[PDB]
Amino acid sequence: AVVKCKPTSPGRRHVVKVVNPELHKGKPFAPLLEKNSKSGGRNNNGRITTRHIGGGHKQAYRIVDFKRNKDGIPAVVERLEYDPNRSANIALVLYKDGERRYILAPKGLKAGDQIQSGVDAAIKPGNTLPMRNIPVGSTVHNVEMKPGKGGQLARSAGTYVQIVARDGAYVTLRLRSGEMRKVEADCRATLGEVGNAEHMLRVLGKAGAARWRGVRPTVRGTAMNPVDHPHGGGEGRNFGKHPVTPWGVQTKGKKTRSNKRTDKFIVRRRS
Amino acid sequence: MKRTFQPSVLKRNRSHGFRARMATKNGRQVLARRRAKGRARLTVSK
RNA sequence: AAUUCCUUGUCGGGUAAGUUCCGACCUGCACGAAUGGCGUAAUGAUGGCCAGGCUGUCUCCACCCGAGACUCAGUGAAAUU
RNA sequence: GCUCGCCGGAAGACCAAGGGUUCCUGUCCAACGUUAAUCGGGGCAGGGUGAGUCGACCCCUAAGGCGAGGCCGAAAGGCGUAGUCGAUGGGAAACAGGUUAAUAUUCCUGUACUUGGUGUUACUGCGAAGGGGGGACGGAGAAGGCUAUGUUGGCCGGGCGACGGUUGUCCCGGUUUAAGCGUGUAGGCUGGUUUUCCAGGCAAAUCCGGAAAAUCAAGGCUGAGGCGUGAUGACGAGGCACUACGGUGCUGAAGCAACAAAUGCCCUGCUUCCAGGAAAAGCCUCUAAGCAUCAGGUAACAUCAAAUCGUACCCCAAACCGACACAGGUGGUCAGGUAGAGAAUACCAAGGCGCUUGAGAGAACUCGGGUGAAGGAACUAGGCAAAAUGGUGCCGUAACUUCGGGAGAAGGCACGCUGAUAUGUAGGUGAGGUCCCUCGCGGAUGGAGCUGAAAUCAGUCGAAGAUACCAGCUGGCUGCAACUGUUUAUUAAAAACACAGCACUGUGCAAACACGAAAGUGGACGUAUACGGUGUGACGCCUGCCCGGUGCCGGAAGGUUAAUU
RNA sequence: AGGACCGAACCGACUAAUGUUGAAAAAUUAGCGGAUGACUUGUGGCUGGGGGUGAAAGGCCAAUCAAACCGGGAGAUAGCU
C-alpha cells in the first residue's frame, strides 16, 4: 500500500512509502546466502569506470533460481521475503522431496499456492514451460534467450512479455520497451507478471535517502572548468556548444548500437 | 597542527623494506646503485 | 530590478532634514517563460532598511586594579651598512 | 620542616602507537639548562626487565597482495586458476595477599585451572580434502531485576579542648577480604518421546530436510546477582620494643544492618522500523573408500610435557610528530564528596603541581580588566566593539500557513529562611509475625524501621531571595536560495556546489559506456518499474511563436567521388 | 517516529582584538555553527603525473601544483642585464 508521511519536519513532507505486510518479518534462509562486497565503481585496475557509485547499506546476496529445471515435482510457497539486491520480491518454495529454493514472486502469488515446471505443467501463474507449449498471446516473464542458461528478460518490478506469433522454431515477443524480438521456441518462460507494481510510486523525499542506496552526487558539467569537461566554464552561464558527454559524444539523439552480430532477431526496434 | 610524518614501523617496512625492493626489476636496480656508491645502509630494514 | 546609461526618473510613505529603504507609475538604453517565468509557509554565523531596550561608540574624557615600558644584578639577538 | 596558592571528566592513574636506557644507586659541574647551581631527562661507572594461564609466535579467515600450469603481450611485462600469504575480527587455562633502591597476575605464601603425550584397567564400531548443525553478526526505543559505588545508623578504639560553651542528639578514625568449587534464582527461547516411509543434501548416511501415525503434556537449553564454601586464614586502626632516627620483628579490637544507585551486568535478550545488516577454523554430529583376535573410540587413575621472543621507563608529554626542555597535534581504559537535569559550572578528597631569570620603582604610551555625573547612536562606510537579555512553574500569545508550524512569539505574576498542617504528609523500600504449600533462592497476609517530593496557611530578615559561577535581546518591511548539507588546508562559507522532484536522449544483454596495444575487469552475479549521459532544481499556477542557419534522426531518383582493374 | 529542537565531549571555523625578527612558517583569548547523521574516529588496503581524485575552488596528490618530486639529455637556448 502507498502511504504518505506527515510533514513533521523538512525532509518528510514529500516522502511516500510502499508497505507490504505480507513480507516475512524475520531472518532469511541461511543456506541460500552468500557474501556480496561493494566495489565503488572501480575495476581490477583500481580506476573508476562507472561514476556515482559508493557507500550504502551492507547487503547479502540471495541465490535465486532463474532456470527452473526441476520438472515433475510440485512445490508449495512458504512465505514472501524482501530482497535488497533487486526491486522485485522473492518467494521461498518447498518441494515434495524436501528441497527449498528462491524464485521471483509473480503478481498474485500467496503462501500455500502450488507451482510446477515442465512440458506437462498447467497454465497458471508461477508455472514454467517452454514457449512451444504456451498459447500465443499470453503474458509471461523471466524469459530465456538461449535454452538452458536461465531467464534474462522481464525480471524487474512490474515487467512482462507478450507472445505475438509462432512461425517455426522461433517465437516473436513484444518486450517492455516495445521492441519486436524473436527467440527459439525452446526457451522456458514463467506465466504471469512480476508483482511489485507499486514500486514505481515511491518518493525518496531527501538527499540522504539516495545515499542509502549507494548513489553518489552528480556534478552537472557546465559548472566545471574547460580542462575538466567539454561544457567547460565561462564568465557566468554561457554554454554555447552542442550537448556532449565527457570524451565527446552527442547525447541528444546519436544512436550507439554497433553490434551487427545478431541483426536478425530485431524487427521493430522501437518507436 | 598535524604534520606530514606519522611514524609506523609496519608501513615503513612494507613500503621501503628489503623484500619490497627485491620484488620488482626496478627495485633491484635501486639496490645495485646503492651498492656501487658504497652506502652503509641499503634500506630502512632496521 | 543582483538587469535602468540618462538618474538622486516622477508621485506618495517614514525623518526637523532620506543619492539608501518600502509602495505605485511604465520612456523595459539593454526582462521574459526548464542555460526556466511569476508566486511561496518554514529555514539562513546570507544582502538592504526601520523601531523598543541598552550602553564610554560619541559630546569629553576622569580615576582605579594587574602585565610590559623605566632603574639594579646575570645571560645575551636581529634586519642594515 | 611549617604555612600560602593552583589543577582535580585533570595539570590524577593505567596502556597501545612511537621512542630506545630517558629507569635505580654512587660520583663530577668544563660544555648542555635562555640566570646561579651543591641540582637535572647533562658527563663517567655500576646495577636493574624472572610467565603452561598477560601479549607475540601459533590455528582461521576479510579488504587486498603474490601466484605452479594457463591466457595475453615487440622486450620489460599484464591478468588470473589450483594454491599460498595477509588483523584492525574468531579460537584452551590464575586469583588474593606479601616483598626490592629499581621487576612481578612473571619472584615468595595460600588456594585453583586448561590443552596434549605415554602407561595401566574396564567397556567398545573406529574411520575424510566429503554432508549437516553450530560459530553468525543492523539501527532505534522501552522498561524490569542487579552490581560497582556512595550516604546514614550500629559496633570497636581514641579524645574532653590555646578564647565564651562542650559527659553529650558531642568530636576524629576504622568497620576490608578474590579466582575456583557447589547451589541454579529474577527473567528469555522452544511442545516432547516412539515407530514406519521418501524424486532432496554431486555417492553413501542412524545425521539434516520432507510426509503419514501413535502416546503424554512435563522435557530440555540459556541465564546477571544473591547465599554457602574458599577463610580457626589473610588484611586490619592503634600499641609494645630495636632504634645510624634510614626502619623491622612481636602482638593486634570491631569487621554488621538499612537506604540510594549507574552510561556497567542479565541483554548476541525483548519490542519496533526499512536502508534488510562479514568470512573461515576450533567445536558438536553423519557416513564412503578402508581396517577388525589388531588399529582406533569413551571413562577412571598414575606420570611427563607446555618451548622460543617481549616485560625497565615516558606515553595529552621536557622522552612521540612539530629544527627548541616550542601556549600546537595525538587513539583506548578508570570516573569520589557538597550544590546541580548533567561527563556543564563553583569549591574540595585520593594524587599531583607553582609552569628554569630575579630584585626595586609606581612617568608618557601599548596590552588585559573594573566603575562613572548629565545626555543616550549625536559615533561610524556599517550599532564594529561594548552594554543588555538569560532559570523553573502558572497565566497568556498576532499576521500568515504546505495545517506540521509561526511559538520559548510578544507580555504578566510567583521564588529565601522558620513553624504548623504532618513530633516527616502523598509516594517508594520493606523486617518480625500469622497461614499455606510441588517445603524452595516459594506464595498470601502483615506492617516495624529506613528514605522522602510538592502544595497551602501563618510568621520573619535585607536595598536586592532564578542573589555567586552558570544562563535566549526582542519586534516590523524586503532581495536571493526551498530546506539539513558541501567548498578555495594558509586573505573569499556565499546568491556558488549537492539535493529530492521533472524532462529529453542512449542502451535487448557478449547492453550502452569506461579502464586496457591484448587478455580481461567494472557496469552487475543487475535485465527497460533497469542502467549511462545531459539540462533543470521542493511545492503551487504555468511553460507561448520560429526548423532559414548549425547539430541530430530518416529518405532515394539524379549529379559528383578512393583504393582496385 | 525525525538528514526534529536546546546543549557538553567530539567535529567545524562566522566576527573582533592581540601577535606579525610571534609561544606558533595560520596560533591564542572572548563570542559563534553542527552535535542519531549526506555524522565522526582508530588500524590496514587500492587508485601515479597529461595521470589520479574532486557535493567542482583549477581544489588536493608529504609546509611545493594551469601539470608533483629525484636523476639524466645538459655547460638546453638567451639578438637581453
mmCIF file of all heavy atoms in Angstrom, chain A residues 44-83:
data_model
loop_
_atom_site.group_PDB
_atom_site.id
_atom_site.type_symbol
_atom_site.label_atom_id
_atom_site.label_comp_id
_atom_site.label_asym_id
_atom_site.label_seq_id
_atom_site.Cartn_x
_atom_site.Cartn_y
_atom_site.Cartn_z
ATOM 1 N N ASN A 44 39.537 -3.927 -11.774
ATOM 2 C CA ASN A 44 40.748 -4.552 -11.251
ATOM 3 C C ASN A 44 41.981 -3.677 -11.439
ATOM 4 O O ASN A 44 43.025 -3.964 -10.843
ATOM 5 C CB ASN A 44 40.968 -5.915 -11.910
ATOM 6 C CG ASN A 44 41.130 -5.821 -13.412
ATOM 7 O OD1 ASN A 44 41.126 -4.734 -13.985
ATOM 8 N ND2 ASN A 44 41.277 -6.970 -14.061
ATOM 9 N N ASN A 45 41.893 -2.629 -12.252
ATOM 10 C CA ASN A 45 42.969 -1.656 -12.378
ATOM 11 C C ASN A 45 42.938 -0.602 -11.280
ATOM 12 O O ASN A 45 43.868 0.205 -11.190
ATOM 13 C CB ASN A 45 42.903 -0.965 -13.744
ATOM 14 C CG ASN A 45 43.452 -1.826 -14.862
ATOM 15 O OD1 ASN A 45 44.206 -2.768 -14.623
ATOM 16 N ND2 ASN A 45 43.077 -1.504 -16.093
ATOM 17 N N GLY A 46 41.897 -0.588 -10.450
ATOM 18 C CA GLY A 46 41.763 0.401 -9.404
ATOM 19 C C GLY A 46 41.200 1.730 -9.852
ATOM 20 O O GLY A 46 41.056 2.633 -9.019
ATOM 21 N N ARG A 47 40.875 1.882 -11.131
ATOM 22 C CA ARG A 47 40.347 3.129 -11.659
ATOM 23 C C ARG A 47 38.825 3.113 -11.639
ATOM 24 O O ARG A 47 38.194 2.057 -11.729
ATOM 25 C CB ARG A 47 40.836 3.360 -13.089
ATOM 26 C CG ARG A 47 42.346 3.351 -13.249
ATOM 27 C CD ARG A 47 42.952 4.699 -12.917
ATOM 28 N NE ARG A 47 44.357 4.770 -13.301
ATOM 29 C CZ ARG A 47 44.792 5.087 -14.512
ATOM 30 N NH1 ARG A 47 43.955 5.377 -15.495
ATOM 31 N NH2 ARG A 47 46.100 5.113 -14.746
ATOM 32 N N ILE A 48 38.236 4.302 -11.524
ATOM 33 C CA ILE A 48 36.788 4.428 -11.599
ATOM 34 C C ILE A 48 36.348 4.249 -13.045
ATOM 35 O O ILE A 48 36.836 4.938 -13.949
ATOM 36 C CB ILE A 48 36.333 5.788 -11.049
ATOM 37 C CG1 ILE A 48 36.484 5.827 -9.528
ATOM 38 C CG2 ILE A 48 34.891 6.065 -11.444
ATOM 39 C CD1 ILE A 48 36.403 7.222 -8.948
ATOM 40 N N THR A 49 35.421 3.319 -13.269
ATOM 41 C CA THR A 49 34.858 3.083 -14.592
ATOM 42 C C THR A 49 33.404 3.505 -14.709
ATOM 43 O O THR A 49 32.966 3.862 -15.804
ATOM 44 C CB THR A 49 34.970 1.601 -14.965
ATOM 45 O OG1 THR A 49 34.372 0.801 -13.939
ATOM 46 C CG2 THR A 49 36.427 1.202 -15.129
ATOM 47 N N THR A 50 32.650 3.466 -13.614
ATOM 48 C CA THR A 50 31.286 3.977 -13.569
ATOM 49 C C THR A 50 31.193 4.960 -12.413
ATOM 50 O O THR A 50 31.534 4.616 -11.277
ATOM 51 C CB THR A 50 30.270 2.845 -13.398
ATOM 52 O OG1 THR A 50 30.565 1.790 -14.320
ATOM 53 C CG2 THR A 50 28.859 3.352 -13.646
ATOM 54 N N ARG A 51 30.740 6.174 -12.700
ATOM 55 C CA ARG A 51 30.680 7.219 -11.693
ATOM 56 C C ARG A 51 29.386 7.122 -10.889
ATOM 57 O O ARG A 51 28.442 6.417 -11.252
ATOM 58 C CB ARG A 51 30.793 8.595 -12.348
ATOM 59 C CG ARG A 51 31.964 8.731 -13.307
ATOM 60 C CD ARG A 51 32.039 10.126 -13.905
ATOM 61 N NE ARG A 51 30.785 10.519 -14.534
ATOM 62 C CZ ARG A 51 30.526 11.734 -14.997
ATOM 63 N NH1 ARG A 51 31.418 12.708 -14.924
ATOM 64 N NH2 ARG A 51 29.342 11.978 -15.549
ATOM 65 N N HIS A 52 29.357 7.850 -9.771
ATOM 66 C CA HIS A 52 28.157 7.991 -8.944
ATOM 67 C C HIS A 52 27.814 6.689 -8.219
ATOM 68 O O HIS A 52 26.641 6.368 -8.024
ATOM 69 C CB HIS A 52 26.966 8.467 -9.777
ATOM 70 C CG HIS A 52 27.303 9.552 -10.753
ATOM 71 N ND1 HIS A 52 28.298 10.477 -10.525
ATOM 72 C CD2 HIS A 52 26.778 9.856 -11.963
ATOM 73 C CE1 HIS A 52 28.370 11.305 -11.551
ATOM 74 N NE2 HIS A 52 27.459 10.951 -12.437
ATOM 75 N N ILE A 53 28.834 5.938 -7.813
ATOM 76 C CA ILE A 53 28.654 4.695 -7.072
ATOM 77 C C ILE A 53 29.561 4.729 -5.851
ATOM 78 O O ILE A 53 30.753 5.034 -5.966
ATOM 79 C CB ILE A 53 28.959 3.458 -7.938
ATOM 80 C CG1 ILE A 53 27.980 3.378 -9.111
ATOM 81 C CG2 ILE A 53 28.883 2.193 -7.096
ATOM 82 C CD1 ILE A 53 28.368 2.369 -10.165
ATOM 83 N N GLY A 54 29.000 4.415 -4.686
ATOM 84 C CA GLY A 54 29.774 4.389 -3.461
ATOM 85 C C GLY A 54 28.919 4.438 -2.212
ATOM 86 O O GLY A 54 27.871 5.088 -2.193
ATOM 87 N N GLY A 55 29.360 3.756 -1.159
ATOM 88 C CA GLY A 55 28.632 3.757 0.092
ATOM 89 C C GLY A 55 27.401 2.869 0.045
ATOM 90 O O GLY A 55 27.275 1.962 -0.783
ATOM 91 N N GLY A 56 26.483 3.142 0.959
ATOM 92 C CA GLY A 56 25.232 2.420 1.052
ATOM 93 C C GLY A 56 25.221 1.454 2.223
ATOM 94 O O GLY A 56 26.140 1.404 3.044
ATOM 95 N N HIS A 57 24.148 0.672 2.285
ATOM 96 C CA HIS A 57 23.942 -0.284 3.362
ATOM 97 C C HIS A 57 24.535 -1.638 2.994
ATOM 98 O O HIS A 57 24.509 -2.045 1.830
ATOM 99 C CB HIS A 57 22.450 -0.434 3.663
ATOM 100 C CG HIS A 57 22.157 -0.940 5.041
ATOM 101 N ND1 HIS A 57 21.545 -0.166 6.003
ATOM 102 C CD2 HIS A 57 22.386 -2.143 5.618
ATOM 103 C CE1 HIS A 57 21.413 -0.869 7.113
ATOM 104 N NE2 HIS A 57 21.916 -2.072 6.906
ATOM 105 N N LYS A 58 25.073 -2.328 3.996
ATOM 106 C CA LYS A 58 25.578 -3.678 3.791
ATOM 107 C C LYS A 58 24.457 -4.593 3.309
ATOM 108 O O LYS A 58 23.314 -4.507 3.766
ATOM 109 C CB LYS A 58 26.175 -4.217 5.089
ATOM 110 C CG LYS A 58 27.110 -5.397 4.908
ATOM 111 C CD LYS A 58 27.862 -5.691 6.193
ATOM 112 C CE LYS A 58 28.820 -6.855 6.028
ATOM 113 N NZ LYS A 58 29.576 -7.127 7.280
ATOM 114 N N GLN A 59 24.792 -5.478 2.373
ATOM 115 C CA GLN A 59 23.810 -6.367 1.769
ATOM 116 C C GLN A 59 24.387 -7.768 1.648
ATOM 117 O O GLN A 59 25.604 -7.963 1.600
ATOM 118 C CB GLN A 59 23.372 -5.865 0.388
ATOM 119 C CG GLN A 59 22.662 -4.524 0.411
ATOM 120 C CD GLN A 59 22.447 -3.958 -0.976
ATOM 121 O OE1 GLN A 59 23.207 -4.241 -1.899
ATOM 122 N NE2 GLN A 59 21.404 -3.153 -1.130
ATOM 123 N N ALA A 60 23.487 -8.748 1.600
ATOM 124 C CA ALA A 60 23.839 -10.140 1.374
ATOM 125 C C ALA A 60 23.090 -10.644 0.149
ATOM 126 O O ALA A 60 21.945 -10.259 -0.097
ATOM 127 C CB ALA A 60 23.505 -11.013 2.588
ATOM 128 N N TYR A 61 23.748 -11.509 -0.617
ATOM 129 C CA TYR A 61 23.194 -11.993 -1.875
ATOM 130 C C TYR A 61 22.353 -13.240 -1.639
ATOM 131 O O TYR A 61 22.790 -14.175 -0.963
ATOM 132 C CB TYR A 61 24.309 -12.298 -2.875
ATOM 133 C CG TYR A 61 23.793 -12.738 -4.225
ATOM 134 C CD1 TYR A 61 23.152 -11.841 -5.067
ATOM 135 C CD2 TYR A 61 23.936 -14.050 -4.651
ATOM 136 C CE1 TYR A 61 22.674 -12.237 -6.298
ATOM 137 C CE2 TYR A 61 23.459 -14.455 -5.881
ATOM 138 C CZ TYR A 61 22.830 -13.544 -6.700
ATOM 139 O OH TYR A 61 22.353 -13.941 -7.927
ATOM 140 N N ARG A 62 21.148 -13.247 -2.202
ATOM 141 C CA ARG A 62 20.263 -14.402 -2.166
ATOM 142 C C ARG A 62 20.401 -15.173 -3.473
ATOM 143 O O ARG A 62 20.329 -14.583 -4.555
ATOM 144 C CB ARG A 62 18.809 -13.974 -1.963
ATOM 145 C CG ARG A 62 18.416 -13.752 -0.514
ATOM 146 C CD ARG A 62 18.922 -12.417 0.003
ATOM 147 N NE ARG A 62 18.235 -12.010 1.222
ATOM 148 C CZ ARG A 62 18.672 -11.076 2.055
ATOM 149 N NH1 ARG A 62 19.800 -10.424 1.832
ATOM 150 N NH2 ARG A 62 17.959 -10.790 3.141
ATOM 151 N N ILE A 63 20.598 -16.483 -3.369
ATOM 152 C CA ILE A 63 20.752 -17.331 -4.546
ATOM 153 C C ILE A 63 19.361 -17.641 -5.088
ATOM 154 O O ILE A 63 18.605 -18.406 -4.486
ATOM 155 C CB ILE A 63 21.522 -18.616 -4.219
ATOM 156 C CG1 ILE A 63 22.921 -18.275 -3.700
ATOM 157 C CG2 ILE A 63 21.611 -19.509 -5.450
ATOM 158 C CD1 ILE A 63 23.685 -19.462 -3.160
ATOM 159 N N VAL A 64 19.025 -17.049 -6.230
ATOM 160 C CA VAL A 64 17.724 -17.227 -6.862
ATOM 161 C C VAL A 64 17.865 -18.229 -7.997
ATOM 162 O O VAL A 64 18.918 -18.335 -8.636
ATOM 163 C CB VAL A 64 17.163 -15.883 -7.373
ATOM 164 C CG1 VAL A 64 15.799 -16.080 -8.014
ATOM 165 C CG2 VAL A 64 17.084 -14.876 -6.239
ATOM 166 N N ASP A 65 16.792 -18.974 -8.250
ATOM 167 C CA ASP A 65 16.763 -19.988 -9.301
ATOM 168 C C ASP A 65 16.087 -19.386 -10.528
ATOM 169 O O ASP A 65 14.859 -19.272 -10.581
ATOM 170 C CB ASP A 65 16.035 -21.240 -8.823
ATOM 171 C CG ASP A 65 15.871 -22.272 -9.919
ATOM 172 O OD1 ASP A 65 16.754 -22.354 -10.799
ATOM 173 O OD2 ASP A 65 14.859 -23.003 -9.901
ATOM 174 N N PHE A 66 16.893 -18.999 -11.515
ATOM 175 C CA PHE A 66 16.379 -18.450 -12.762
ATOM 176 C C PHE A 66 16.189 -19.505 -13.844
ATOM 177 O O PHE A 66 15.671 -19.179 -14.918
ATOM 178 C CB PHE A 66 17.322 -17.361 -13.288
ATOM 179 C CG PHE A 66 17.329 -16.110 -12.458
ATOM 180 C CD1 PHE A 66 18.485 -15.693 -11.823
ATOM 181 C CD2 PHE A 66 16.183 -15.349 -12.317
ATOM 182 C CE1 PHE A 66 18.495 -14.543 -11.061
ATOM 183 C CE2 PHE A 66 16.188 -14.198 -11.556
ATOM 184 C CZ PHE A 66 17.346 -13.795 -10.927
ATOM 185 N N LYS A 67 16.590 -20.750 -13.595
ATOM 186 C CA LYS A 67 16.492 -21.802 -14.599
ATOM 187 C C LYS A 67 15.177 -22.567 -14.498
ATOM 188 O O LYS A 67 14.506 -22.788 -15.511
ATOM 189 C CB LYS A 67 17.675 -22.765 -14.463
ATOM 190 C CG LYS A 67 19.000 -22.172 -14.905
ATOM 191 C CD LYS A 67 20.138 -23.160 -14.735
ATOM 192 C CE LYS A 67 21.435 -22.611 -15.302
ATOM 193 N NZ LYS A 67 22.583 -23.530 -15.067
ATOM 194 N N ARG A 68 14.797 -22.978 -13.289
ATOM 195 C CA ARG A 68 13.557 -23.718 -13.063
ATOM 196 C C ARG A 68 13.526 -24.993 -13.909
ATOM 197 O O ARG A 68 12.660 -25.187 -14.764
ATOM 198 C CB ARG A 68 12.338 -22.835 -13.352
ATOM 199 C CG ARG A 68 12.205 -21.637 -12.429
ATOM 200 C CD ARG A 68 11.668 -22.042 -11.066
ATOM 201 N NE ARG A 68 10.312 -22.570 -11.146
ATOM 202 C CZ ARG A 68 9.223 -21.826 -11.276
ATOM 203 N NH1 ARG A 68 9.291 -20.506 -11.347
ATOM 204 N NH2 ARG A 68 8.035 -22.420 -11.338
ATOM 205 N N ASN A 69 14.498 -25.868 -13.651
ATOM 206 C CA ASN A 69 14.643 -27.118 -14.385
ATOM 207 C C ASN A 69 14.288 -28.335 -13.536
ATOM 208 O O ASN A 69 14.736 -29.446 -13.834
ATOM 209 C CB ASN A 69 16.067 -27.247 -14.928
ATOM 210 C CG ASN A 69 17.117 -27.150 -13.840
ATOM 211 O OD1 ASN A 69 16.807 -26.860 -12.685
ATOM 212 N ND2 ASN A 69 18.369 -27.393 -14.206
ATOM 213 N N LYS A 70 13.493 -28.148 -12.484
ATOM 214 C CA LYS A 70 13.017 -29.245 -11.642
ATOM 215 C C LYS A 70 11.603 -29.590 -12.098
ATOM 216 O O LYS A 70 10.620 -29.018 -11.626
ATOM 217 C CB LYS A 70 13.055 -28.859 -10.168
ATOM 218 C CG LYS A 70 14.403 -29.072 -9.503
ATOM 219 C CD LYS A 70 14.356 -30.214 -8.503
ATOM 220 C CE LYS A 70 13.653 -29.804 -7.221
ATOM 221 N NZ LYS A 70 13.623 -30.909 -6.225
ATOM 222 N N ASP A 71 11.504 -30.538 -13.025
ATOM 223 C CA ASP A 71 10.235 -30.911 -13.630
ATOM 224 C C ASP A 71 9.654 -32.136 -12.937
ATOM 225 O O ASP A 71 10.389 -33.029 -12.507
ATOM 226 C CB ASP A 71 10.410 -31.196 -15.123
ATOM 227 C CG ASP A 71 11.273 -30.162 -15.816
ATOM 228 O OD1 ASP A 71 11.186 -28.972 -15.450
ATOM 229 O OD2 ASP A 71 12.040 -30.540 -16.727
ATOM 230 N N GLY A 72 8.327 -32.171 -12.835
ATOM 231 C CA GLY A 72 7.645 -33.317 -12.267
ATOM 232 C C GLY A 72 7.636 -33.379 -10.759
ATOM 233 O O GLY A 72 7.328 -34.434 -10.198
ATOM 234 N N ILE A 73 7.964 -32.283 -10.080
ATOM 235 C CA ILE A 73 7.983 -32.251 -8.620
ATOM 236 C C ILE A 73 7.243 -31.005 -8.150
ATOM 237 O O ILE A 73 7.810 -29.904 -8.182
ATOM 238 C CB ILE A 73 9.422 -32.280 -8.078
ATOM 239 C CG1 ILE A 73 10.290 -33.225 -8.912
ATOM 240 C CG2 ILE A 73 9.424 -32.705 -6.617
ATOM 241 C CD1 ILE A 73 11.709 -33.366 -8.404
ATOM 242 N N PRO A 74 5.988 -31.116 -7.713
ATOM 243 C CA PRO A 74 5.259 -29.926 -7.265
ATOM 244 C C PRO A 74 5.913 -29.286 -6.050
ATOM 245 O O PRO A 74 6.570 -29.943 -5.240
ATOM 246 C CB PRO A 74 3.862 -30.463 -6.927
ATOM 247 C CG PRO A 74 3.757 -31.762 -7.644
ATOM 248 C CD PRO A 74 5.142 -32.320 -7.685
ATOM 249 N N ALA A 75 5.722 -27.973 -5.934
ATOM 250 C CA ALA A 75 6.266 -27.200 -4.828
ATOM 251 C C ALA A 75 5.173 -26.307 -4.260
ATOM 252 O O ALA A 75 4.202 -25.970 -4.941
ATOM 253 C CB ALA A 75 7.467 -26.353 -5.266
ATOM 254 N N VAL A 76 5.344 -25.927 -2.997
ATOM 255 C CA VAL A 76 4.383 -25.095 -2.282
ATOM 256 C C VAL A 76 5.115 -23.887 -1.716
ATOM 257 O O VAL A 76 6.203 -24.019 -1.145
ATOM 258 C CB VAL A 76 3.671 -25.880 -1.160
ATOM 259 C CG1 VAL A 76 4.674 -26.361 -0.120
ATOM 260 C CG2 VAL A 76 2.592 -25.027 -0.515
ATOM 261 N N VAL A 77 4.517 -22.712 -1.878
ATOM 262 C CA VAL A 77 5.112 -21.473 -1.392
ATOM 263 C C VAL A 77 5.013 -21.427 0.125
ATOM 264 O O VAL A 77 3.963 -21.727 0.706
ATOM 265 C CB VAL A 77 4.422 -20.256 -2.032
ATOM 266 C CG1 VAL A 77 5.070 -18.965 -1.554
ATOM 267 C CG2 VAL A 77 4.469 -20.352 -3.549
ATOM 268 N N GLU A 78 6.112 -21.047 0.775
ATOM 269 C CA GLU A 78 6.167 -20.939 2.228
ATOM 270 C C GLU A 78 5.936 -19.515 2.717
ATOM 271 O O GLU A 78 5.165 -19.304 3.657
ATOM 272 C CB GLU A 78 7.518 -21.449 2.740
ATOM 273 C CG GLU A 78 7.802 -22.899 2.395
ATOM 274 C CD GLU A 78 8.304 -23.693 3.585
ATOM 275 O OE1 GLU A 78 9.374 -23.345 4.125
ATOM 276 O OE2 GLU A 78 7.626 -24.663 3.982
ATOM 277 N N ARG A 79 6.588 -18.532 2.102
ATOM 278 C CA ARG A 79 6.454 -17.148 2.534
ATOM 279 C C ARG A 79 7.083 -16.241 1.487
ATOM 280 O O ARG A 79 7.854 -16.690 0.633
ATOM 281 C CB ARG A 79 7.113 -16.922 3.898
ATOM 282 C CG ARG A 79 8.631 -16.960 3.855
ATOM 283 C CD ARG A 79 9.217 -17.496 5.149
ATOM 284 N NE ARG A 79 10.672 -17.428 5.153
ATOM 285 C CZ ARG A 79 11.451 -18.048 6.028
ATOM 286 N NH1 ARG A 79 10.947 -18.795 6.996
ATOM 287 N NH2 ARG A 79 12.770 -17.914 5.931
ATOM 288 N N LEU A 80 6.740 -14.960 1.566
ATOM 289 C CA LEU A 80 7.344 -13.925 0.741
ATOM 290 C C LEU A 80 8.419 -13.202 1.542
ATOM 291 O O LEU A 80 8.286 -13.001 2.751
ATOM 292 C CB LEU A 80 6.294 -12.920 0.257
ATOM 293 C CG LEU A 80 5.266 -13.399 -0.772
ATOM 294 C CD1 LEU A 80 5.951 -13.951 -2.012
ATOM 295 C CD2 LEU A 80 4.328 -14.435 -0.173
ATOM 296 N N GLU A 81 9.490 -12.811 0.855
ATOM 297 C CA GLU A 81 10.639 -12.207 1.512
ATOM 298 C C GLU A 81 11.072 -10.958 0.760
ATOM 299 O O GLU A 81 10.771 -10.778 -0.422
ATOM 300 C CB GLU A 81 11.811 -13.192 1.611
ATOM 301 C CG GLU A 81 11.509 -14.422 2.451
ATOM 302 C CD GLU A 81 12.749 -15.019 3.087
ATOM 303 O OE1 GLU A 81 13.864 -14.536 2.799
ATOM 304 O OE2 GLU A 81 12.608 -15.972 3.879
ATOM 305 N N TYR A 82 11.786 -10.094 1.473
ATOM 306 C CA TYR A 82 12.331 -8.861 0.924
ATOM 307 C C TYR A 82 13.751 -9.115 0.437
ATOM 308 O O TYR A 82 14.577 -9.658 1.178
ATOM 309 C CB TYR A 82 12.317 -7.754 1.979
ATOM 310 C CG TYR A 82 13.020 -6.482 1.568
ATOM 311 C CD1 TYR A 82 12.341 -5.475 0.900
ATOM 312 C CD2 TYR A 82 14.362 -6.284 1.857
ATOM 313 C CE1 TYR A 82 12.979 -4.310 0.525
ATOM 314 C CE2 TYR A 82 15.009 -5.124 1.486
ATOM 315 C CZ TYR A 82 14.313 -4.140 0.821
ATOM 316 O OH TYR A 82 14.953 -2.981 0.450
ATOM 317 N N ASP A 83 14.029 -8.731 -0.807
ATOM 318 C CA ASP A 83 15.340 -8.924 -1.414
ATOM 319 C C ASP A 83 16.001 -7.570 -1.629
ATOM 320 O O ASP A 83 15.479 -6.753 -2.408
ATOM 321 C CB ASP A 83 15.218 -9.676 -2.740
ATOM 322 C CG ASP A 83 16.541 -10.244 -3.211
ATOM 323 O OD1 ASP A 83 17.566 -10.007 -2.539
ATOM 324 O OD2 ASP A 83 16.558 -10.931 -4.252
#
